mmCIF file of C-alpha atoms in Angstrom:
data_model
loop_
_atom_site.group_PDB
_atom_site.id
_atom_site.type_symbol
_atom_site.label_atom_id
_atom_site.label_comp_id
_atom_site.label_asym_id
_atom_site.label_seq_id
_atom_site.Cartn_x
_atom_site.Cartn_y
_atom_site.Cartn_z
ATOM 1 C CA UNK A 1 147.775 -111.833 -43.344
ATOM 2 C CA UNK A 2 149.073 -108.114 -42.725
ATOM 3 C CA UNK A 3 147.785 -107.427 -39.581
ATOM 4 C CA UNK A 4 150.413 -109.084 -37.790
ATOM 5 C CA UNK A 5 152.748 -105.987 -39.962
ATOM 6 C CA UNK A 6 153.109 -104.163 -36.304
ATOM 7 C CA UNK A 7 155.846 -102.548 -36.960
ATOM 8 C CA UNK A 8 154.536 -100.670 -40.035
ATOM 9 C CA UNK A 9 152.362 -98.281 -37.822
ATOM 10 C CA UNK A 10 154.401 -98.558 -34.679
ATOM 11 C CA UNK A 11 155.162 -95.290 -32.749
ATOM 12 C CA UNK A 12 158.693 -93.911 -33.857
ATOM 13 C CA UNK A 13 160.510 -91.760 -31.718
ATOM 14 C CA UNK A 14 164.123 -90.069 -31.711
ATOM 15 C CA UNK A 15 166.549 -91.222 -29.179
ATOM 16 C CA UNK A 16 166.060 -88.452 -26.319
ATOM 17 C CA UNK A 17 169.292 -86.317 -25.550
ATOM 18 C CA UNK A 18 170.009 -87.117 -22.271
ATOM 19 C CA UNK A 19 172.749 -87.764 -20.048
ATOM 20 C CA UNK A 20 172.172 -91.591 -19.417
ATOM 21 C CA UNK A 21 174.864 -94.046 -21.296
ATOM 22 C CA UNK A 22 173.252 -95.976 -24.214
ATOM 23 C CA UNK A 23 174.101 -99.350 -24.140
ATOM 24 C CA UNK A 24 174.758 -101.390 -27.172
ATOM 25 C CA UNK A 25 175.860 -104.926 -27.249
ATOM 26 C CA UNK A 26 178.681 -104.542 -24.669
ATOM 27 C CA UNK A 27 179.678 -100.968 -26.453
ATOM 28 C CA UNK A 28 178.887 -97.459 -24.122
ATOM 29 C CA UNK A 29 177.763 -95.020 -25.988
ATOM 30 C CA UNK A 30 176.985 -90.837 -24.984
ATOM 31 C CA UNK A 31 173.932 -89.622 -27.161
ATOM 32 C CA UNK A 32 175.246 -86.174 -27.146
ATOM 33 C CA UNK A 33 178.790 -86.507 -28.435
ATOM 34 C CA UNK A 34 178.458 -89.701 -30.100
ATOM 35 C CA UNK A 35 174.519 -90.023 -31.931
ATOM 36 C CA UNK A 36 176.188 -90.654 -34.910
ATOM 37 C CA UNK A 37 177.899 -94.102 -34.265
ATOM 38 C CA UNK A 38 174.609 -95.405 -32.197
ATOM 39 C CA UNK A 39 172.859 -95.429 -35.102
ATOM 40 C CA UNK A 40 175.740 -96.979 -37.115
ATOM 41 C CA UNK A 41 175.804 -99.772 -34.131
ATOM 42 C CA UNK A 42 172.143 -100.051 -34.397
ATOM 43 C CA UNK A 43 171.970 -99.971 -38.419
ATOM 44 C CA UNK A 44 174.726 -102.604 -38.276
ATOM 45 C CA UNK A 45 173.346 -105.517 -36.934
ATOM 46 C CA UNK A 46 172.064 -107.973 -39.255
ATOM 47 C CA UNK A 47 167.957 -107.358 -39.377
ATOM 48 C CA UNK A 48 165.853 -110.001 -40.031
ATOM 49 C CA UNK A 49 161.881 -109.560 -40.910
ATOM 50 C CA UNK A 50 158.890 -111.245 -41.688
ATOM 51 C CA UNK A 51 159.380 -112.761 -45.466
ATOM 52 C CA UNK A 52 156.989 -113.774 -48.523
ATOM 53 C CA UNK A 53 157.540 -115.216 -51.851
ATOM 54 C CA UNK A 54 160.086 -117.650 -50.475
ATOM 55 C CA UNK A 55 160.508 -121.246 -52.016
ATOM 56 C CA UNK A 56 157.308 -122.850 -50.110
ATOM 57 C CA UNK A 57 158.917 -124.894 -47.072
ATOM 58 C CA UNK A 58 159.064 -128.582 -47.663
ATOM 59 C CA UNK A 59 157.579 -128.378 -51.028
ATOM 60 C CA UNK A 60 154.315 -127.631 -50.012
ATOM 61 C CA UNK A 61 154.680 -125.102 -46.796
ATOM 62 C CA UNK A 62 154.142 -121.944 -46.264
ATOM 63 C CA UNK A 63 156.182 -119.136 -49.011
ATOM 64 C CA UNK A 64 155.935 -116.367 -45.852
ATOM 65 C CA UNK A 65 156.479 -116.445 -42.276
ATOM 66 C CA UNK A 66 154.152 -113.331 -41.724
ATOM 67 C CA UNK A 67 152.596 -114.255 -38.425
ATOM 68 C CA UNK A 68 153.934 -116.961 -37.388
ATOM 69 C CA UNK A 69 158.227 -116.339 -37.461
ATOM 70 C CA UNK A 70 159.272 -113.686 -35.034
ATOM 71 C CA UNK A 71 160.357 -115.520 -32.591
ATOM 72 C CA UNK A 72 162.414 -117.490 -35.358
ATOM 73 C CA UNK A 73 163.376 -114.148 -36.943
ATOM 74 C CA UNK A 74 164.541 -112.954 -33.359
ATOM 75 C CA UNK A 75 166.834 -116.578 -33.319
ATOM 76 C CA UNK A 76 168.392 -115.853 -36.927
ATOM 77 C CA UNK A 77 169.124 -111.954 -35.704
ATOM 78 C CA UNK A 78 170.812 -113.275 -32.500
ATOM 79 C CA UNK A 79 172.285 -116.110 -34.079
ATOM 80 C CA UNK A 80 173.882 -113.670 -36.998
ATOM 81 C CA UNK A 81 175.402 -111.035 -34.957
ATOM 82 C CA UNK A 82 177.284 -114.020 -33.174
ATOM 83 C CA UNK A 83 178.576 -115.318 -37.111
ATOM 84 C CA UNK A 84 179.326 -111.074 -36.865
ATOM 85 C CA UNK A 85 181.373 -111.430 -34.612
ATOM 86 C CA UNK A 86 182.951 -114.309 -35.167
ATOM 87 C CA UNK A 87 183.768 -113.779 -38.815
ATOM 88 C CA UNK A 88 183.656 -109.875 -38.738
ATOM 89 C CA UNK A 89 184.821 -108.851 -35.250
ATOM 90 C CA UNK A 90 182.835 -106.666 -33.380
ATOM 91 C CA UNK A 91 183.831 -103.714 -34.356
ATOM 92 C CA UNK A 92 182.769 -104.398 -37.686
ATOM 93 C CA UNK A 93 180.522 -101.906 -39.024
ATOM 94 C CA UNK A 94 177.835 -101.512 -42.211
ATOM 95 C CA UNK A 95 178.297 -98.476 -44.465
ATOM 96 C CA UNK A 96 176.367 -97.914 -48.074
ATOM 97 C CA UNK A 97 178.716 -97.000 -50.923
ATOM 98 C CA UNK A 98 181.179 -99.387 -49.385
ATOM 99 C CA UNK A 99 182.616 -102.937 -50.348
ATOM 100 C CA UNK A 100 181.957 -105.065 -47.608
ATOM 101 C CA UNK A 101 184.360 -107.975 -46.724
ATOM 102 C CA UNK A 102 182.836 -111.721 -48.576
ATOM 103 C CA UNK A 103 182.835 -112.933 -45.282
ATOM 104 C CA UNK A 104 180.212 -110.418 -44.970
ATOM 105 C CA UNK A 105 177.872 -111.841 -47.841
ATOM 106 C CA UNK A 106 178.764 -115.424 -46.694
ATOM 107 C CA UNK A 107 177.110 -114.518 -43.351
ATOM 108 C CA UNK A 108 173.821 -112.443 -45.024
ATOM 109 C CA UNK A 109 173.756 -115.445 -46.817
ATOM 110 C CA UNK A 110 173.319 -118.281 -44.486
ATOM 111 C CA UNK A 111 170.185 -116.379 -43.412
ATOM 112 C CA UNK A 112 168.824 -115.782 -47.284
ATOM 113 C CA UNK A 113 165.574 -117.827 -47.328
ATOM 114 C CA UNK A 114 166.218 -121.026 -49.262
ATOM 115 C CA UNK A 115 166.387 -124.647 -47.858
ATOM 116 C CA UNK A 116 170.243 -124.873 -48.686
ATOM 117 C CA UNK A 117 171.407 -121.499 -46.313
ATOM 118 C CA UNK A 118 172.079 -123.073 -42.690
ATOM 119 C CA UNK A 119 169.752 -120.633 -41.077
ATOM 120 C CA UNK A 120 167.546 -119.696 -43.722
ATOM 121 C CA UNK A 121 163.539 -120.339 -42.299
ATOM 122 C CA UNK A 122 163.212 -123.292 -43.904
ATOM 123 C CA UNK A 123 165.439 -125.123 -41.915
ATOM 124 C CA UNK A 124 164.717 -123.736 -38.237
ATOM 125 C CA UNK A 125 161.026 -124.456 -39.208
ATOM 126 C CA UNK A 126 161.885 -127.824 -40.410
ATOM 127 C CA UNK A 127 164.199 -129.036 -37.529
ATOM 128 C CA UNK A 128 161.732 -127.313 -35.072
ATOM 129 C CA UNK A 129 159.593 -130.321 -36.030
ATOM 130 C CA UNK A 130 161.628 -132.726 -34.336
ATOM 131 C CA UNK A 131 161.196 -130.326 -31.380
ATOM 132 C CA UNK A 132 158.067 -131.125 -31.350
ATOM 133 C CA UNK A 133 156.564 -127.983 -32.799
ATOM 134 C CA UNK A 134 154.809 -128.102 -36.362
ATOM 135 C CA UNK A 135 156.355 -125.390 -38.914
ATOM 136 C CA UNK A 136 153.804 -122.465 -38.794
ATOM 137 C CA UNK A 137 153.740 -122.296 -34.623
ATOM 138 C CA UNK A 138 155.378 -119.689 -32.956
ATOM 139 C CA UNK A 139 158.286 -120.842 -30.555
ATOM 140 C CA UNK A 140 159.157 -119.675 -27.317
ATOM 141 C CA UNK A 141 163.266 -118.466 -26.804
ATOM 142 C CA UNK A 142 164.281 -122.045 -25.061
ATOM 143 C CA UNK A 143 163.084 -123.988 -28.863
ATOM 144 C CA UNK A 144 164.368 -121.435 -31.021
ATOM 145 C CA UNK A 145 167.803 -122.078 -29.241
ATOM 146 C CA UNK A 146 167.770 -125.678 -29.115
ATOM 147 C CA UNK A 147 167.049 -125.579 -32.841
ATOM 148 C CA UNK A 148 169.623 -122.912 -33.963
ATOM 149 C CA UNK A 149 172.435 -125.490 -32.393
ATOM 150 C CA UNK A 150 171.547 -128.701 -34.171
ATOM 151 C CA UNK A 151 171.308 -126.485 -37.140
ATOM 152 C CA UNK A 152 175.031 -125.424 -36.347
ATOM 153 C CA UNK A 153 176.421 -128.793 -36.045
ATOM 154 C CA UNK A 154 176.161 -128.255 -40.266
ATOM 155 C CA UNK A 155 178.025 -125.080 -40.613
ATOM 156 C CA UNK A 156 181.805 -125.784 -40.497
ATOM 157 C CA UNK A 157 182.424 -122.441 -41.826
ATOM 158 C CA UNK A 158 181.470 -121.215 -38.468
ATOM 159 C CA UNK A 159 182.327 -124.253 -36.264
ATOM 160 C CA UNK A 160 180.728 -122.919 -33.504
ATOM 161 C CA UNK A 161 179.970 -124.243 -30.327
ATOM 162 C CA UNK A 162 176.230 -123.593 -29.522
ATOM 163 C CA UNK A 163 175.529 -123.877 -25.480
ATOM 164 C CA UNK A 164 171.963 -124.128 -23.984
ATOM 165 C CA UNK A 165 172.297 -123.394 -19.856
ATOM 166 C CA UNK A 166 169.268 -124.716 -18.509
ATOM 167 C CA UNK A 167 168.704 -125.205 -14.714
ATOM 168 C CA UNK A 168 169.576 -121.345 -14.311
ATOM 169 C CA UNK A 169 173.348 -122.507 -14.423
ATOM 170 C CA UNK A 170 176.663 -122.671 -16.429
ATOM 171 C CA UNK A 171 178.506 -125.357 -15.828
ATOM 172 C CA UNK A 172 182.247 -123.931 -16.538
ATOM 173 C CA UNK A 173 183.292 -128.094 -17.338
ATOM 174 C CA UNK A 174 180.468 -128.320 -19.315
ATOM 175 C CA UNK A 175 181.738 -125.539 -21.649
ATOM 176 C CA UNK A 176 185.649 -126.703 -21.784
ATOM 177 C CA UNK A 177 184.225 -130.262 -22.712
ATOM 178 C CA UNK A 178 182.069 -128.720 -25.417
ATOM 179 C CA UNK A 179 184.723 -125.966 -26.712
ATOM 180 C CA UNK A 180 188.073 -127.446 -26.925
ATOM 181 C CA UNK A 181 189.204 -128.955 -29.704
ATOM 182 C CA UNK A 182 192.305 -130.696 -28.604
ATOM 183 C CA UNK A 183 194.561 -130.107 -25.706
ATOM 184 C CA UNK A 184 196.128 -126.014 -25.191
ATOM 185 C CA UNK A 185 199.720 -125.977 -25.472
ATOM 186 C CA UNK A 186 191.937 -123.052 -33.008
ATOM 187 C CA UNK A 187 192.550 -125.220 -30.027
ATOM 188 C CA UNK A 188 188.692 -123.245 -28.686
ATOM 189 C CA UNK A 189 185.335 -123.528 -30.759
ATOM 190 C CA UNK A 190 184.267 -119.990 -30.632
ATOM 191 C CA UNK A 191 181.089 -119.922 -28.329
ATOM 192 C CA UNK A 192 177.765 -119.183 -28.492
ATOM 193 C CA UNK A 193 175.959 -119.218 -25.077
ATOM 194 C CA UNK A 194 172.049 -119.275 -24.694
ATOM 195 C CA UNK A 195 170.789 -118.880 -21.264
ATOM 196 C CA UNK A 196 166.563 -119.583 -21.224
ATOM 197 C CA UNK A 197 165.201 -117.243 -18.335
ATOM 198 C CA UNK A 198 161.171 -116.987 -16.965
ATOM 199 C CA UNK A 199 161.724 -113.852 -14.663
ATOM 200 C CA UNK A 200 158.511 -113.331 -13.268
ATOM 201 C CA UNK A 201 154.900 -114.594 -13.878
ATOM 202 C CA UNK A 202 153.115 -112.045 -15.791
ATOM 203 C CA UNK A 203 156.573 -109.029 -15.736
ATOM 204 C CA UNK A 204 159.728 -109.245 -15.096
ATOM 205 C CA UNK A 205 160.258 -109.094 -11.398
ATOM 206 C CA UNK A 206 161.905 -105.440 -10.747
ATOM 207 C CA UNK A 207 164.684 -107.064 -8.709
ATOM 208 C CA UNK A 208 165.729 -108.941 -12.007
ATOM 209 C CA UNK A 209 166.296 -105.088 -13.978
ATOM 210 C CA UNK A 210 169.812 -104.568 -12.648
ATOM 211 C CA UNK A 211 171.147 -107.754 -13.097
ATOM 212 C CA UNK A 212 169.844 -107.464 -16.821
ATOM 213 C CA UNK A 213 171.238 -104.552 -17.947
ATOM 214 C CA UNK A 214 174.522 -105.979 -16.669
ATOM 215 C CA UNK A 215 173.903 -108.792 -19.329
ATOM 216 C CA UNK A 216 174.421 -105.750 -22.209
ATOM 217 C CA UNK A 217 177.704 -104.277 -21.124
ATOM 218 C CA UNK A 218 179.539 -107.606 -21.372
ATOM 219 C CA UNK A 219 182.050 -108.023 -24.201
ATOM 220 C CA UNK A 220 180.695 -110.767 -25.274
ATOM 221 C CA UNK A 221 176.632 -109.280 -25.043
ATOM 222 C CA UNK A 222 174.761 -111.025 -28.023
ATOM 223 C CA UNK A 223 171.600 -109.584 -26.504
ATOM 224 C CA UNK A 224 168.413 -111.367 -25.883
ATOM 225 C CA UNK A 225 165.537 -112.422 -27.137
ATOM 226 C CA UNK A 226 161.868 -112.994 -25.818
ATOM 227 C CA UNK A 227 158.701 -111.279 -26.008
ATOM 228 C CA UNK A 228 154.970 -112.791 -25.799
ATOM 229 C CA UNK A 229 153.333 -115.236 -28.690
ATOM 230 C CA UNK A 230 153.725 -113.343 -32.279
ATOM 231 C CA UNK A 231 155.790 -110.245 -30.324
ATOM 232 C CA UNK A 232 159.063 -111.161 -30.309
ATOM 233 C CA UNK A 233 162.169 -108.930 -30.146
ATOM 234 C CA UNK A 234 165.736 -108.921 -30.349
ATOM 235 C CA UNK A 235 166.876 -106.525 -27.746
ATOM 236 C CA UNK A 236 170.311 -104.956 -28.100
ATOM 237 C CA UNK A 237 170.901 -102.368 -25.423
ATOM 238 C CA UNK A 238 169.375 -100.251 -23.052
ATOM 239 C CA UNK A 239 169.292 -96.872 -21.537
ATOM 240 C CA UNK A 240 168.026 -95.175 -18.827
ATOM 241 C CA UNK A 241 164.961 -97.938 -18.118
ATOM 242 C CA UNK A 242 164.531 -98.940 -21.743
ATOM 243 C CA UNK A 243 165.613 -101.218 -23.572
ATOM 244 C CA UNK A 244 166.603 -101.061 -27.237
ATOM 245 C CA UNK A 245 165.470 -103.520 -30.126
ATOM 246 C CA UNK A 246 164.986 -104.490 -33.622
ATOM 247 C CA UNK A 247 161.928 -105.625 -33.954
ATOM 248 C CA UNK A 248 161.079 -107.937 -36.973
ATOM 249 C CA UNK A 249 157.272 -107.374 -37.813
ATOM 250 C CA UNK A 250 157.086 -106.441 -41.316
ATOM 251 C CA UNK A 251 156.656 -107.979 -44.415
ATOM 252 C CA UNK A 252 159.651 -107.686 -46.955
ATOM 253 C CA UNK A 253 160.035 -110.000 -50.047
ATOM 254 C CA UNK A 254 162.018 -112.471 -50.083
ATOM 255 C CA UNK A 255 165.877 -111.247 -51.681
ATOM 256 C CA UNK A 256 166.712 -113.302 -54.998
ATOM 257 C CA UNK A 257 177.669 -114.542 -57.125
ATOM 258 C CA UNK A 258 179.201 -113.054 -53.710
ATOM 259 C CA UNK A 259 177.251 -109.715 -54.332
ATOM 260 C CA UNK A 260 173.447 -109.625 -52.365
ATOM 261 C CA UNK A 261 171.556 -106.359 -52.099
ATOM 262 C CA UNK A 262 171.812 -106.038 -48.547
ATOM 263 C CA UNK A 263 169.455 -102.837 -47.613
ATOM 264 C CA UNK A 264 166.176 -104.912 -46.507
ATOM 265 C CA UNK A 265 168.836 -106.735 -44.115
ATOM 266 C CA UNK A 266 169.685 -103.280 -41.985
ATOM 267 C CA UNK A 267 166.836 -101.428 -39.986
ATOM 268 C CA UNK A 268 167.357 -97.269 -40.899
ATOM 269 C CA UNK A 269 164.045 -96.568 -38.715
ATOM 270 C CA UNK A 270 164.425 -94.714 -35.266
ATOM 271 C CA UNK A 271 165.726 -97.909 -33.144
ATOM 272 C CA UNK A 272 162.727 -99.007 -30.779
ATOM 273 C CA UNK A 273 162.615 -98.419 -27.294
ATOM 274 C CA UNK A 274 160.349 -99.867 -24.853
ATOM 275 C CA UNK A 275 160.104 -99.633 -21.293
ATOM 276 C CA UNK A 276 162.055 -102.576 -19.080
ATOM 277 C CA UNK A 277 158.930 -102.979 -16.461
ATOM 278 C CA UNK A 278 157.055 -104.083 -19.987
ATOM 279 C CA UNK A 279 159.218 -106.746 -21.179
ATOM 280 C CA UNK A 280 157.630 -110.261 -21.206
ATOM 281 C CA UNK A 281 159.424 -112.393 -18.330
ATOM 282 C CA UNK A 282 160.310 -115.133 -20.690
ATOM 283 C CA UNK A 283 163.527 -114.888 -22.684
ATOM 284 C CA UNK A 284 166.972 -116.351 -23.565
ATOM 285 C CA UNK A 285 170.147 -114.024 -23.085
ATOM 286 C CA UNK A 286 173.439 -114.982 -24.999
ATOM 287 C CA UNK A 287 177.341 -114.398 -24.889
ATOM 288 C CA UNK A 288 179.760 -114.868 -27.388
ATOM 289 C CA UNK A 289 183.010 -115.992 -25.987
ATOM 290 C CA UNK A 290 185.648 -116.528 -29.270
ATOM 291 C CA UNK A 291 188.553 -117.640 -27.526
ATOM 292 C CA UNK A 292 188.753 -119.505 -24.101
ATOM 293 C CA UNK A 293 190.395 -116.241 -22.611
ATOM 294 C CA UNK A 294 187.011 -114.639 -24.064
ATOM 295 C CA UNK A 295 185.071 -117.572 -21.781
ATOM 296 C CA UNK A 296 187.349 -116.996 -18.910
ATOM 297 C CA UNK A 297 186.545 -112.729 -18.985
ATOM 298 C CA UNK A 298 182.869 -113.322 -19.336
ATOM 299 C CA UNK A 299 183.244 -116.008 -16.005
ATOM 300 C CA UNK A 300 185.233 -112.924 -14.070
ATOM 301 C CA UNK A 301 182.284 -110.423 -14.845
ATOM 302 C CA UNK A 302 179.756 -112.978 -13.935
ATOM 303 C CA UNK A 303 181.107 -113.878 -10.683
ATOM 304 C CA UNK A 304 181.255 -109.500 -9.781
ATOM 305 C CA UNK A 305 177.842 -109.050 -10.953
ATOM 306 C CA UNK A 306 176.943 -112.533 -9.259
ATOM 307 C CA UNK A 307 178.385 -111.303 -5.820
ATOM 308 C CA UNK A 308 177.552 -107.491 -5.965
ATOM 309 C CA UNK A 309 170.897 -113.118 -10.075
ATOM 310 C CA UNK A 310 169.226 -114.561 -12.951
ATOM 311 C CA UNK A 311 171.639 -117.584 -13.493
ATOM 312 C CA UNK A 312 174.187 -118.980 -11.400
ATOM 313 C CA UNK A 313 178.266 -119.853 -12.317
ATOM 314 C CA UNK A 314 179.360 -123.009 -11.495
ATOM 315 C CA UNK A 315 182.649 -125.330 -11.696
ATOM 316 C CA UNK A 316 181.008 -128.966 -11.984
ATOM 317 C CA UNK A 317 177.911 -130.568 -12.181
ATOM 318 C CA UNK A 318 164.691 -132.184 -15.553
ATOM 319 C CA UNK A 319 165.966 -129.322 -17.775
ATOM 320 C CA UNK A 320 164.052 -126.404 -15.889
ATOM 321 C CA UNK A 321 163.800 -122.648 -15.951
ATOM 322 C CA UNK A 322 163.584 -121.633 -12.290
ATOM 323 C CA UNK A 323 160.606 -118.731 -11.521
ATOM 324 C CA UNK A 324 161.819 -116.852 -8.355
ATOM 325 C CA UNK A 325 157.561 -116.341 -7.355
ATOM 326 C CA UNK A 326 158.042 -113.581 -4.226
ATOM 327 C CA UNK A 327 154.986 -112.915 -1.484
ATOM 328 C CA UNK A 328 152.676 -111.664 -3.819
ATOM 329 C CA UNK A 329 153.629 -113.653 -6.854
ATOM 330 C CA UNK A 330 152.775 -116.778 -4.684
ATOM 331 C CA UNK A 331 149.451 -115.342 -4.110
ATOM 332 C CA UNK A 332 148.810 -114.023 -7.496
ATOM 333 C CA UNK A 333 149.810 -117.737 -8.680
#
């Protein structure tokens, strides 16, 4: 039950001083003059790892996740630096010997694993039942999604907007009739957009690599997630051809007012790197548009990016996750 640990014997290297930009969740960084605030970026984001000694889940469930939760680990990391942004601002930052804002704790705590936080394990294994997946399987990015917006629909706090683009399309309508609130004269539910992606058969076809490091230098970049059965990741940038990530294999124990000791919930290690050309084609990229003017930015830089593609931009109008299969993929397959 600590084999699937990974990340305690994974490689660690320094970030390599070159001159290629370091991309962090829409933020451009330059390793040389500005190492310092990378880390900060990286150190930031709200981690989230394998857990044990957690109330068992529905009474009589598992009381760890080791082995089975990464790819719901990877959903609560996305899903937090969204509540980050929408409670902290981006430009928030983490800092020891400093007193956080409560919004701050009320976001760690939604995660905290106990069956009354709205993210906590317990419920994203619970209402991944009624996605047809029993708690203790490992879920591809499209479930993990699905779940993480009916689990939303409970947080008023937040009052977010959760929106699952299937089809390889975003339906602009679609996202007005899900984010407005009443007619504009907060009249916009801030917005959390999940776009499920297959881009390739075994890799990600190389065509795809451009188009996907566009999807970090957005504004509104929440990342994505994916990675093969018991691997996932929560990729956060890129440079050169790699792409960054927190990754969420290790065991921690499970965290017992406002105050919570927070250190188990930031990753200090070297941030991981791992070559683009090895990422597993299947994944779910997300945006967070705040505002409607947010929404109506992130629809500009799509349309550039779409014209000079991994999902298309549309006005109006089976759920499936199109595989663009080229010559040899269609004889491979």
């Amino acid at each position: 039950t600590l084999t699937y640990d990974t990340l305690r014997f994974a490689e660690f290297e320094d970030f390599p001083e070159t001159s290629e930009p370091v991309w962090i969740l829409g933020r451009k960084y330059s390793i040389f003059t500005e190492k310092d605030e990378i880390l900060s970026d990286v150190a930031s984001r709200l981690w989230f790892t394998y857990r044990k000694n957690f109330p068992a889940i529905g009474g009589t469930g598992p009381t760890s996740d080791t082995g089975w939760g990464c790819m719901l680990r990877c959903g609560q990391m996305i899903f937090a630096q969204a509540l980050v942004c929408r409670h902290l601002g981006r430009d928030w930052r983490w800092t020891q010997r400093k007193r956080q804002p409560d919004s701050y704790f009320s976001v760690l705590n939604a995660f905290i694993d106990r069956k009354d936080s709205y993210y906590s394990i317990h419920q994203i294994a619970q209402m991944g039942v009624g996605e047809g997946k029993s708690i203790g399987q490992w879920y591809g990015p499209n479930t993990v999604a699905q779940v993480l917006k009916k689990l939303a629909v409970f947080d008023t706090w937040s009052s977010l907007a959760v929106h699952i683009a299937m089809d390889n399309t975003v339906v602009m309508e679609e996202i007005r009739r899900l984010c407005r609130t009443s007619v504009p004269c907060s009249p916009w539910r801030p917005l959390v957009l999940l776009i499920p992606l297959r881009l390739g058969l075994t890799d990600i076809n190389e065509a795809y690599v451009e188009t996907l490091k566009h999807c970090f230098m957005m504004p509104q970049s929440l990342g994505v997630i994916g990675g093969k059965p018991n691997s996932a990741h929560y990729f956060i940038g890129y440079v050169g051809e790699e792409l960054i990530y927190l990754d969420p294999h290790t065991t921690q124990p499970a965290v017992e007012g406002c105050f919570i000791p927070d250190e188990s919930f930031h990753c200090q290690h070297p941030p991981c790197r791992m070559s683009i050309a090895e990422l597993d084609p299947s994944i779910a990229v997300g945006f967070f548009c705040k505002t409607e003017d947010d929404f109506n930015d992130w629809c500009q830089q799509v349309k550039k990016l779409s014209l000079l593609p991994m999902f298309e931009l549309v006005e109006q109008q089976p759920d499936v996750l199109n595989l663009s299969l080229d010559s040899s993929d269609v004889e491979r397959l």
